[PDB]
Amino acid sequence: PVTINNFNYNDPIDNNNIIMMEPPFARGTGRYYKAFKITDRIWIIPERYTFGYKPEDFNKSSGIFNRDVCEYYDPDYLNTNDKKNIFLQTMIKLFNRIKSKPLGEKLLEMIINGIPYLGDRRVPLEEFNTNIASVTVNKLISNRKKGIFANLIIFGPGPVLNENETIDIGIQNHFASREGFGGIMQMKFCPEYVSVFNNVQENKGASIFNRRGYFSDPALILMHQLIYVLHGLYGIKVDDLPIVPNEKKFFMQSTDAIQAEELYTFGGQDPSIITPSTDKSIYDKVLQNFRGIVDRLNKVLVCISDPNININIYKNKFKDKYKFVEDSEGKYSIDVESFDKLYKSLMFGFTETNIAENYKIKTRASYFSDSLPPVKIKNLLDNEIYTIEEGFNISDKDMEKEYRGQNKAINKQAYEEISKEHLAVYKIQMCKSICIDVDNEDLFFIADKNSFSDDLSKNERIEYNTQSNYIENDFPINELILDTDLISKIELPSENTESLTDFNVDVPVYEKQPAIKKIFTDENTIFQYLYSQTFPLDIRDISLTSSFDDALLFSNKVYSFFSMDYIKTANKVVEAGLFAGWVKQIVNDFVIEANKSNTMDKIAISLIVPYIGLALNVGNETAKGNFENAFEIAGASILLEFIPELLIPVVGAFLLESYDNKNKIIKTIDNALTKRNEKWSDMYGLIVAQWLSTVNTQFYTIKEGMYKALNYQAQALEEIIKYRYNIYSEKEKSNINIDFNDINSKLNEGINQAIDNINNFINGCSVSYLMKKMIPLAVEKLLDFDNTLKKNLLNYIDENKLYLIAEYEKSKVNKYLKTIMPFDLSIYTNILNNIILNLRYKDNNLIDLSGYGAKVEVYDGVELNDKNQFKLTSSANSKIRVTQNQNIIFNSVFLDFSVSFWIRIPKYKNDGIQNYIHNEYTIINCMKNNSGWKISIRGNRIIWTLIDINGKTKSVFFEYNIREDISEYINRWFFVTITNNLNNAKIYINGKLESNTDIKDIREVIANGEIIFKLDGDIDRTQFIWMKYFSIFNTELSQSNIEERYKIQSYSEYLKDFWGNPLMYNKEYYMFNAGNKNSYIKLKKDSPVGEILTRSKYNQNSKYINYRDLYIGEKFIIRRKSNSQSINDDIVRKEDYIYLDFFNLNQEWRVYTYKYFKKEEEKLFLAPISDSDEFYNTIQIKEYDEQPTYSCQLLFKKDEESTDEIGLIGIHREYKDYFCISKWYLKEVKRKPYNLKLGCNWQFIPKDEGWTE
């Protein structure tokens, strides 16, 4: 339906796709531009937007245009035909990328179909007119002029490259695209100089490269502007109460008025800033405009300008555009449901956040988030950099995880930083009564109290037909996606028409303003404190001080907000012998000083960071005194720099009508109650909007300041280390081995963890402030209004007591107006993940799903299965080779990383217990030159060894007892995790810490970058090891995280056997009871019951080994009962209905139970397969225990559809242990926590190659 054309700037004019356009703003002043029709009704003019701007404004000066962007100027840009062609091809590529997905195709289709109405406010309703600057545009055909219809015109960037904009045509101070009619909309755009942002509000754990800055995708910016184009075309770019910033104080950011359209377009929490009253006002204005449009359509009879126009075709087109409805007679009418859906989709469906989520792009979290300087993209036409399908985040280039393609630190080859010479910013010079310059974008944003509507104070007239109107600022994007049609073609009229004659139009005028404002203030706040932590590049020998004044006095002194011990250590000077140790200790102390929190349990908040006040001194002198005590005593209001006035209007009283018709007087009371509920939510929405636009912004600024302060501290420490290293002599430097990349990575990880803690604390503080100091004030007046409404309703009823035969109504009112509508914040709101080598199964082969593109080579000697289990044997070709990207590796210096997997080791050969005890064989190796880590297995132990460059060895192992009667680790799957940090190396088994060692003596470990899975050593030919779910993390894992991962990896739909493998149908099994681990079942010699005997034990040769036989007793088998599901899969699933048969001689007998028994217990009835009315033969398999386990329970049921439980199979004893069914167990399983030692717990043991007599 939508086609992207191809051409070049030098193609000859054909007057069909390449034309000599006359832009509307020319005002009949000639100056045609070569225009290209990329798509139907869409044109591109690769030229600079010089309409309104003076030519001298293109060069940078001391002035500025906008006070919230880092402007960039380049007059030479777009000065040669070649540059024009590059711009045109980039536009083509961006449009193709947009159309590559259904959502973009739908947006483009709506733009194309949304042709402007053929008129405006200055036209009689009963006729069309095209001689308007907002409808037709002129073109030159001569080598005189004709007119053509257009929707969108895209120009090149104006004086400011990184400031894209969309412009609508206004005439006589009236805009036709704000009044339902619509008009031609222009754009100024540049795909090269995109903006940069940060994700301080988003937590991704202790990620090295997180919060390093991201650059936007030009396609997303283009779609963002196209949303404005769509809104303008559909005539819903209406103006209402703007969000005016407050500029009374000095620390408050200044900005131009913000309309609701921008916040709606952005999406997320932004629409919550618009009060529901303003939402309703905009909705009503749009509805009135649409009513005017439909009246015009119904009253149209003829056309004047171009008689060749087919009026019926255009009427049908407009009907399709506005979703009107044609009656049987022919009249056009508005359907409320269709109009509501259209409005919600246009305003809340097409949003930047939704588009980014659909296209898998990263973007600003909120409209009020801070903005960084822009960057220049090296080349957007290189498919190795920017692909249409995946954009920057190319999966093939290992750039899909965490939007790595957009990260400034990762994709350093895809952009160039802008020179500060050309950047122009609006700065405030604060001088103490010496003078510090601060970018205006770094100040607090506080909306003035005049930005919020007080329409809640107006009286409401309630009638029988009154309806509750509630606009939900949301729309399911999936519904919009599924509404797109990618087959049906368009049937638009011809774009050509009569030439334009009327050129009256209002061209905007722009003027620069000074970029510097000087003010005087004697207050030392966030800005002054932040400045004190910066030093000139010239200074090299700096020193940390805890005195803010001292830091502000001497350039060589840098303020700090950490413990005095850290300050003393940072300044310490040591000989080269202890230099590496000193660096390690100071880096660890930096990571520890940050990461400091105190638990909070008296606030509904979890943790508090104590050093914010020292860092920033924000609010009522937070630095002085104990910050924690001040917080506990005065709430979170201490942190705020400005307590804002709260607007709480007095809800106007209702004025009900007097309808004599009981029915039409009783509906009025219910309408009043519904309207009251509406007023309640309107009040909640107003309070939330005020909180978001006055309080939360300050907290976000505090978070940004803390991030900046932490970065300043890290930079100062790095500079100090560099200076001290340079002080040392050449020989000492040669002796010393230090990698600054490791220092930077560790500092960034510490900063990220600290920022996570700060983010959680600040979010808790803001939410608590909203719930405690804002809502109750509104609720008080809401209760007052409720009482007033109750009084009004009662006299209304009394005045109509003669009518409406009323006690029920009085009771209903008294009951309803006693309750309060709860406040729901979610209405207005919206794995470890530090993994680098997640190995998984794709198709008869292993791959790395971490997203770093590790190269995996699997040899023919390895057996794999769908259960992600792979087996290593003694064959030379049973080997796996993993090559890791050099960029993504574990820290060599501080050595913080973890390794997790599931393992299964066979049982020691009975005769070969000497080789078992003495021979150690490696199973995993990551060694390059005798340095690295490896995992080996000496019989009865699992050793993890670590060797440094010098040759120092540190080992941590885990030994599972081999004397146990029934071992839980011998040859059953179990979960191994190994964790290493700068100091200690720990080993956990099945989520429980099992051992640790001190590795303080380790010097340095070099990563081999080549992991080999292979059994190496003096192993026997029969050796074989099973492994599963191998993964590596680049951080030290906590006990809770390990336990959670163990639980997650242990969950499966199916059931597990004794070894831990899936339980299968039609597979011979032996039964093992957890409560009687030493007992087995043997069919009675005479009676048809199973006697319980005692398991045998090893008594052959050695006192050093002891175990109990397992392959004894009757061989059981599970048979599918109904055979309903497909026979392809034989795995047994929980709650399945089964027959528990067993092989006796050559026959297959079945386990039954007595239909009626008096006593609690009753011996089972083992007998051949048959059908009878005296026994139940249906068994359900259940797993009551929530924690991981290989046990299961068996329950007897009268029938599949019956809800009567018979009892649980088990063993009891009066000696004479018996294999029975008990009704008592039915209760014991429910007594939390589940008792794993109960007699109803069962396990199945199939013959396995890993267990021998």
Next chain:
Amino acid sequence: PINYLQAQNTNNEKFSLSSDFVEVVSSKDKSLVYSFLSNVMFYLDSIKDNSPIDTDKKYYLWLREIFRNYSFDITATQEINTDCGINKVVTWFGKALNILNTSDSFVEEFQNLGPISLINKKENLSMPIIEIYGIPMLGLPLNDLNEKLFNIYLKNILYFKKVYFNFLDQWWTEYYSQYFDLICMAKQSILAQEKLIKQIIQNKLQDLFKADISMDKLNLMNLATEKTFIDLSNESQIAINNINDFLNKSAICVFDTNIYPKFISFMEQCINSVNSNVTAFIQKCTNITEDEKLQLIKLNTFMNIDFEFFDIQSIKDLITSETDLIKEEKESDYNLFLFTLQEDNNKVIEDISGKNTLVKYSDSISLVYGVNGDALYLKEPDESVSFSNKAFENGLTNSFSICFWLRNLGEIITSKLIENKADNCGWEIYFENNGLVFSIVDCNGNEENIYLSDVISKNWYYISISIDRLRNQLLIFINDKLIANQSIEQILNIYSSNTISLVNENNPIYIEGLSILNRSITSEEVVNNYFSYLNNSYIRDISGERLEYNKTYELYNYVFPENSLYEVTENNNIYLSIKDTNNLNIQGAKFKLINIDANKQYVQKWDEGVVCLLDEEKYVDISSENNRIQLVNSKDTAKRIIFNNDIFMPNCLTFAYNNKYLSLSLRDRNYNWMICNNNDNIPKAAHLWALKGI
């Protein structure tokens, strides 16, 4: 430490708390008592010189604040990163017992100094006497000598354990004894502080009794005080448990970081002797090759790792007694955990939490499988169920929560559901309008009624209400969402009664999994329980009831939850499509689910079946030309679909064929066909379906 402990006891009934030990001991009047409760004393000093307590409202507020401050102070902990994981240190352990109380925070010293610093007698180890007999000699072949050497190797390994065990016993006798003594001294301070607070409360209540207040209010205040005493006892027990865990972990890590290295060092100086003796004996044997001797020496030599027996988990399981296991088994957070079983015409409903609540129910009640088990079914009008327990009296300072599953089969006039009200005090739940209402009222007139909407009939709902009086926070969840987070700071004593009544009042209802907890719950707990309860291998309709075969249903797509698919004839073929916006009045198509085992009634996950559509008894087939789902009048040609569902979308199911999920398709000239999709451009939410009872 004993002096500090004795400073916390007193005989006078009009004493006063103080934090200066020297001031307390120097007190001639003996009117002072030493206490480390900072918050309680600060609060007491704050109200000092204020209006006297005369009204029961003031007394309730005073008691609530005292209880809150005492609990915050006693249970205070600070988490620190130790080599042995993370330890929850007790902040106040320094001020009590005068340990590491020199200056600054106690945690700060405890971090910059090992846990060994707590005890006053360190370095008590002593090296045991070691007798390592040397290998005796007669020659023998490598085949026989190998077994001899292996036996000697095993014997030496065993001796190296005997020594490890001796060192462990030394640690237990000399080091763990001091930590257990510290534990005993610490739990004595907690009881002393509890006694002090109780005496303060009793003195204040006695003073109030000599006022102009009605006898009924005074009795209510006395009962509230009695309940607050149990609450304080629970808080003190929590503090005792924290102290126990913290000090036990400290002792274990002391062994790890202060004794094991010395044992390793001592044996490192003994493995050399064994190795030398073995080498000498091997060299003294003649009938063996030199390479054989080298290999044997390489085999029979001990490295450090050969005598490392430390197992942190074994130590933890070694200091755990049967009493600890019994306490863990007997520890429960439920004051009522309903258990219902139908048996064989012997329906049993009872509490299994161990609190033995007396349940009185009429024989008219029934039991049905509601969500994941038998559910009380109140059908006949005027049916009542009552649960009796003293703990249900609630009071002033006690946090609890109700949790259950509800299904209303009636309409929507007002109707009581659950209540524990005595005239005015207590809490209530009742249907009102098209939703529920939760009301809590104190004996002083303060009320708090919340309306929870979207409780329309014929739907399963999961109600979870929590009252946490430590934060004065009220949390109400429905399904898996947070509806209310109100504050109850103005809600005083709600002492109501010992029994809560459950009634129907003309509205039939299923009630399942009723549970009463003696503590507040978290959002994570509610979400986990809600999603784990529904993970039962059963596929449910949109209502929430079990999906069953041969029942007439209507099919909806999750993306469009108001559009029912209908049949459309195109190109002499019948396909299922979505109703257009204009023609949204056509009656939706009705479906039926068939199965190979026609006896089976209730659908289960992974079940394979045939979809039956109702005149000619149509069946579902998958077109091989356009991949759309068409209808064929023959069960032989119909496909065998597999039914499943997503865990996090419990009431919506998924169809599968050849491992391909059936799903909707993009718009096609006012149609949205049902297809067997493979493209990735269709949102993953489009292959989730819902069946509604017709």
